[PDB]
Amino acid sequence: SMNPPPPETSNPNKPKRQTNQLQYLLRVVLKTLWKHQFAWPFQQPVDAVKLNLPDYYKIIKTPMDMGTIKKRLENNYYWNAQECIQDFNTMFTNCYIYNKPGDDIVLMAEALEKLFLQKINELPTEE
Numbered sequence: 001s002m003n004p005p006p007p008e009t010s011n012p013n014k015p016k017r018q019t020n021q022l023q024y025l026l027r028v029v030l031k032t033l034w035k036h037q038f039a040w041p042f043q044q045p046v047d048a049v050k051l052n053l054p055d056y057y058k059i060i061k062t063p064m065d066m067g068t069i070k071k072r073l074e075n076n077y078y079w080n081a082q083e084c085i086q087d088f089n090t091m092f093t094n095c096y097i098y099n100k101p102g103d104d105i106v107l108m109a110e111a112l113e114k115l116f117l118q119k120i121n122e123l124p125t126e127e
């Protein structure tokens with residue numbers, strides 16, 4: 001059984017910015033979700049080997065997790081806030097695609113997603 005390589009968090013030829021919106025995504029959005037009691041299953045790539053989920057990466061072809069997002073934010077990997085927002089939405093959608101409705105992990109994603117939506121509702125206007 002094998003895991004794929006993780007999503008990239010560094011690419012020197014990808015143009016990058018540090019914007020106030022991206023700072024908010026790190027200081028408010030990521031930090032709020034990361035400290036949550038339900039954050040742990042989403043703090044690193046899904047380890048399909050250790051979890052005995054050989055079909056995970058057969059179904060999920062765009063993996064994403066908050067460990068990757070955290071590294072991307074700390075490395076100033078993004079050009080804009082929408083790119084980072086898309087990563088969070090990919091992570092939530094993957095969870096809903098792979099898992100059964102009402103599974104514990106789905107309730108955990110839903111709780112993080114509720115907070116995510118509350119925080120991005122107040123994404124600051126770009127300076």
Ligand SMILES: COc1ccc(S(C)(=O)=O)cc1-c1cn(C)c(=O)c2ccc(-c3cn(CCF)nn3)cc12
Pocket residue numbers: 040041042044045046047048050051053094095098099105
């Ligand atoms: C509590 O969930 C986790 C804990 C630790 C890590 S880990 C080693 O990567 O740090 C990952 C997860 C995890 C995350 N996500 C996003 C998922 O969709 C997901 C889906 C299924 C399972 C799972 C299924 N079964 C057997 C029943 F079929 N056992 N586990 C795990 C996950």
